[PDB]
Amino acid sequence: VWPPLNLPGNASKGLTELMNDNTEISYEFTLKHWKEVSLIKFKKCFDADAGEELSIFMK
């Protein structure tokens, strides 16, 4: 899915390759751009959770 809630900035190429959910994103494609994305908010979480893996803080 790679669901970013942003990129209103610059790229209609980003628009296409996002709205199609392009499973690939080329590096050479990236090198020709600046400020690709910043998922910057203060709202909620994404693809992660905390309070598990009992090994760490038991060691």
Binding site: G9, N10, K35, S38
Partner: peptide
């Protein structure tokens, strides 16, 4: 002449993008 509307649109959105970059700090 009427192409200038989309020209200034994309240019000003690029400018707001630059403003975000400035917010980068």
């Amino acid at each position: 002449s009427q192409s200038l509307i989309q020209t200034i649109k994309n240019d000003i959105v690029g400018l707001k993008a630059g403003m975000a970059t400035l917010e980068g700090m």
